[PDB]
């Protein structure tokens, strides 16, 4: 038995739509402190980790210290496709079902029998990155959305605290510089590094623009790219993307 009420259903449904690009199935880890969603994609290239603190919700109650909720992503996302923009959404559970409840102009519920999703271990967060930058989620989205359709490999490099995104495609190449100098980066510190990542995985994450206004970007040579999407209630959407053959 748990109950959680999100006011901004739209910007929640896009979080789940982003997870569904990487995972078929996942667990909601429900605790006093909030809900966590963690997992590695089938190709073992991407690990994601989403934390929605209790503060993120309006109503938030539990019947236990730890509740594991196994769900298919397609099944949940098909349901969230029926959201009605003035619908306040409620997540709800018990011994057998996860319930998604649309309430607003009138009340509607969708039931999914629980499924057995294998647990996830990182393990374990923290190496540090020789480079860190802060930027608007929209800026990142504007840039990745253009580049995403040009090629398969994203080259990222830093020089003298400026950040560079590059794609060399079969018909075009595009290289863009971001800096604090003209506020395209909010903050930017670290060493001159260089790495490359699969465009496809990185481009999947731009939908987070709809849930996150600010973001952090971490990386280095021959190490994963970390995308931290800052969510409004100290919540975060974390995406770790493995480097390519170096």
């Amino acid at each position: 038995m748990m109950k959680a009420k999100v006011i901004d259903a739209v910007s929640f449904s896009y979080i789940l739509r982003t997870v569904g690009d990487f995972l078929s199935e996942a667990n909601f880890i429900v605790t006093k402190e909030g809900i966590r969603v963690s997992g590695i994609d089938p190709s073992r290239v991407v690990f994601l980790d989403i934390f929605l603190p209790s503060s993120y919700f309006e109503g938030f109650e539990v019947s236990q210290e730890k509740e594991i909720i196994g769900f298919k992503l397609e099944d949940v996302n098909d349901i969230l496709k029926r959201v009605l923009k003035d619908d306040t959404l409620i997540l709800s559970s018990n011994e057998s079902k996860l319930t998604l409840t649309f309430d607003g102009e009138f009340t509607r519920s969708f039931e999914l029998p629980l499924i057995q999703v294998e647990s996830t271990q990182p393990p374990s967060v923290n190496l540090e990155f020789p480079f860190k930058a802060q930027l608007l989620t929209i800026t990142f989205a504007d840039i990745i959305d253009e580049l995403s359709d040009l090629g398969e490999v994203l080259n990222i490099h830093s020089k003298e605290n400026k950040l560079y995104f590059e794609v060399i495609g079969d018909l075009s190449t595009a290289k863009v510089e971001l800096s604090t100098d003209n506020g395209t980066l909010l903050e930017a510190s670290g060493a001159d590094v260089s790495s490359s990542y699969g465009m496809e995985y990185v481009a999947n994450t731009t939908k987070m623009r709809r849930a996150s206004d600010s973001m952090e970007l971490y990386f280095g040579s021959q190490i994963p790219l970390k995308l931290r999407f800052k969510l409004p209630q100290e919540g975060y959407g974390d995406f770790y993307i493995a480097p390519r053959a170096d």
């Binding site: 099944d75 098909d78 349901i79 029926r82 009605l84 102009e105 009138f106 009340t107 509607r108 519920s109 969708f110 039931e111 999914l112 029998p113």
Partner: protein, 249 residues
């Protein structure tokens, strides 16, 4: 022969589009009381009835009651020329079928659709001689949301009476859906003579709701225990478009 002038063209097209959800040919019946069409999905489960009385028609005149048969081509021919503009329709019986004159309100001019149709004898209106226990009114928006909800989860819609509210459910295995309709959330009207639960082809519900597309008006729904469901809307500019759905006994 028959001579008719229609004050609202946009509705005229809504009606023909509606009957399309049940048939691809259309028999128009011109009686002394007005125009009516009535057609049935040919496994008998869904019925489309169009009822347009004399008085809502700017001009209506007949020599004798007749019917006209618009084949699949003629319907496509009429619908190809559909528009939401404010306009006038002049419809007359001709020797080879029908002549339709469309004259908009602003810009004034008119194009003429010649229709090839066989004449016939008028059938009469057999409206299901049952009056249903459960009664309620909302709009097309509400029904559209429900049609797409149940479809996502099942092939069958089970509609149930509960106290002060209407309960709608679907899902045959484990994956399920429940909606609660009540007075002013969102219903403008609710009447419960006695308790009832019936079942219908969710995809015949969809097809019926689909036949509300071009109508602005509120929509009455009615049903009874293991009985058919009527879905009723009165066009802004006159007549009624009705659907019935035979239950799964």
């Amino acid at each position: 022969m028959v001579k008719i002038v229609y004050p609202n063209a946009k509705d005229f097209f809504s009606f023909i589009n509606s009957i399309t959800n049940v048939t691809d040919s259309i028999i128009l019946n011109f009686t002394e009381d007005g125009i009516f069409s009535r057609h049935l999905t040919e496994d008998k489960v869904l019925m489309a009835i169009m009822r347009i009385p004399k008085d809502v028609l700017s001009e209506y005149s007949i020599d004798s009651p007749t019917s006209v048969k618009l084949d699949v081509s003629s319907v496509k021919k009429i619908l190809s020329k559909a528009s939401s503009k404010k306009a006038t329709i002049e419809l007359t019986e001709t020797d080879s079928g029908l002549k339709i004159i469309i004259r908009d309100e602003k810009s004034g001019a008119k194009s003429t659709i010649y229709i090839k149709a066989e004449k016939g004898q008028v059938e009469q209106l057999t409206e299901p001689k049952v009056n249903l226990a459960v009664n309620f009114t909302t709009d097309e928006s509400v029904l559209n949301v429900i049609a797409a909800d149940v479809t996502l989860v099942g092939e069958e819609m089970r509609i149930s009476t509960e106290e002060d509210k209407i309960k709608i459910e679907a899902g045959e295995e484990g994956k399920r859906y429940v909606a609660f309709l009540m007075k002013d959330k969102p219903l403008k009207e609710l009447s419960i003579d006695t308790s009832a639960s019936s079942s219908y082809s969710a995809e015949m519900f969809k097809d019926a709701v689909k036949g509300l597309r071009g109508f602005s008006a509120p929509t009455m729904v009615s049903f009874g225990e293991n009985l058919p469901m009527k879905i009723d809307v009165e066009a802004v500019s006159g007549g009624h478009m009705i659907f019935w759905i035979a239950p799964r006994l």
